[PDB]
Amino acid sequence: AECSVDIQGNDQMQFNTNAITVDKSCKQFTVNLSHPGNLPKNVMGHNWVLSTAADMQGVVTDGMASGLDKDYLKPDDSRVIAHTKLIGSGEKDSVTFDVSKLKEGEQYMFFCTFPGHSALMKGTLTLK
């Protein structure tokens, strides 16, 4: 889809994709996140967070420590290229970012920073 992707996080701690392609032609890229199921944000909250593969662990650790009210993200974290809000079932949130913030030769990971979820809820994002 021309410069966007729609992604779901379910009540079983799964995103419905593990690989996102971003066409070099896109000026901006948008992620539209939703949450099928019935579980509340405090129990099964999902976000979509983007960093380099190298930065992922530091982002997830500091995010766990940040707490629910900060959407499990360290405020002003320089390693986070883009992120949605944390959402519960029935909710939706989108993020758009400048594709110029990605370069070739660099590995990107997307993931959710809700406590313990990133073991399951992660994937690659590839400039193509």
Instruction: Give the residues lining the site for Ag ion (CB under 5 A).
Output: 46, 112, 114, 117, 121
Annotated binding site, which residues?
46, 112, 117, 121
| Measured distance CA(112)–CA(14) in Å, rounded | 10
3-state secondary structure 51-72: EEHHHHHHHHHHHHHHCHHHCC
The helix/strand/coil state of 101 is helix
Q: How far is the CB of 15 from Ag ion (least distance, A)?
A: 8
CB burial of residue 72 (10 Å; 0-12, 13-18, 19+): buried
Cβ-based nearer residue to Ag ion, 102 or 110: 110
Cβ-based nearer residue to Ag ion, 104 or 119: 119
Q: How far is the CB of 3 from Ag ion (least distance, A)?
A: 25
Residue whose token pair is 């896109």: 26
Q: How far is the CB of 121 from Ag ion (least distance, A)?
A: 5
127 touches 78 (CB < 8 A) = no
Q: How far is the CB of 116 from Ag ion (least distance, A)?
A: 9
Residue whose token pair is 């399951």: 120
Annotated binding site for Cu cation, which residues?
46, 112, 117, 121
